[PDB]
Amino acid sequence: LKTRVITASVVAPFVVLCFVSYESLIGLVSAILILAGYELITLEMKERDARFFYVILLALYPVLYGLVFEEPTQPLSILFITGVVFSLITDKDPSQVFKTVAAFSIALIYVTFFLSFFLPIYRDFGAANALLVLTSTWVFDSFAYFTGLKFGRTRISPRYSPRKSLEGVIGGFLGVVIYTFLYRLVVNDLLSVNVICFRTFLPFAATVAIMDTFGDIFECALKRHYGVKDSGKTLPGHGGMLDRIDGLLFVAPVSYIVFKILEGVVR
């Protein structure tokens, strides 16, 4: 029924509404994680059994981190230890146990541990900022696109990756800078929901810019290894789930580090 836009229009609002409660964010993350991991793990394994177990592990973290332990390091270790254990049992080949753990390992840090960073950002910095981080990336990719088509080269992106320029990243940086008075006072004049200060603007942009840049390149290197141009096919809009959030993954952690440094405690 003229499907691409009947549902490319559906997504955007869904995500945001999930920022309503802390418990809600966990829900989206755990959900984004099932898909994201399903793809990164399925590239290393096409076994009926295997894939699924580790994929369930990857998604379990947010709920364990936020709801059970209210501490991150403990579950991170339980999930990784459980993994290695399981692998020893399933893969009877030793040199192959390595490969599955290596995959599970990159999956854990990059996908699960990184994406889960909205969790601390949410509670420690207000859902407001939480939503700002995720969107700044949606905005970075857009501003870098126009400025990219029109402002030419001094390309940073290698063979295997798509195409990304120093000039192209700068535009997206600016677009983010500008995007935030708008977000800032439209969120602060509107409602007294504390957001980042007018002085922590540059860094946030710089990381949303520089991290998204590295996250996409890492993925292309990650993709190219497994041989595909696309990460996986779980999604409608062209490009799979991991592909959508790749740059975001690096951004969030680094950006939390920045906030933690410049916005103290807001709770």
Are 240 and 233 in contact, with CB atoms under 8 Å apart? Answer: yes
Closest to Mg ion by CB, 91 vs 246, is 246
Tokens 């959030």 belong to 245
* Contact map string, positions 135 to 164, toward a second copy, x by CB under 8 A: -----------------------xxx----
Structure tokens, 205: 């942009």
Helix (H, G, I), strand (E, B) or coil at 253: helix
Greatest distance between any 2 Cα atoms in the chain: 62
Q: Is 219 in the site for K ion (CB under 5 A)?
A: yes
Are 253 and 114 in contact, with CB atoms under 8 Å apart? Answer: yes
CB of 248 to Mg ion, least distance (A): 7
Measured CA to CA, the distance from residue 206 to residue 194 in angstroms comes to: 21
* Contact map string, positions 157 to 196, toward Hg ion, x by CB under 5 A: ----------------------------------------
Structure tokens, 119: 């969790």
Q: For a second copy, which residue of 148, 171, 247, 253 counts as binding (CB under 8 A)?
A: 253
Structure tokens, 262: 């410049």
Structure tokens, 6: 């009947």
**Within 61-80, which residues bind a second copy (CB under 8 A)?**
71-74, 76-78, 80
CB of 191 to a second copy, least distance (A): 30
Measured CA to CA, the distance from residue 28 to residue 208 in angstroms comes to: 21
**Residues, the chain, total?**
267
Chain residues binding K ion by CB under 5 A are 216, 219-220, 246
Contacting positions for a second copy (CB under 8 A): 71-74, 76-78, 80-81, 84-85, 88, 92, 94-95, 97-98, 101-103, 105-106, 108-110, 113-114, 117, 120, 158-160, 211, 214, 217-218, 220-222, 224-225, 250, 253-254, 256-257, 260
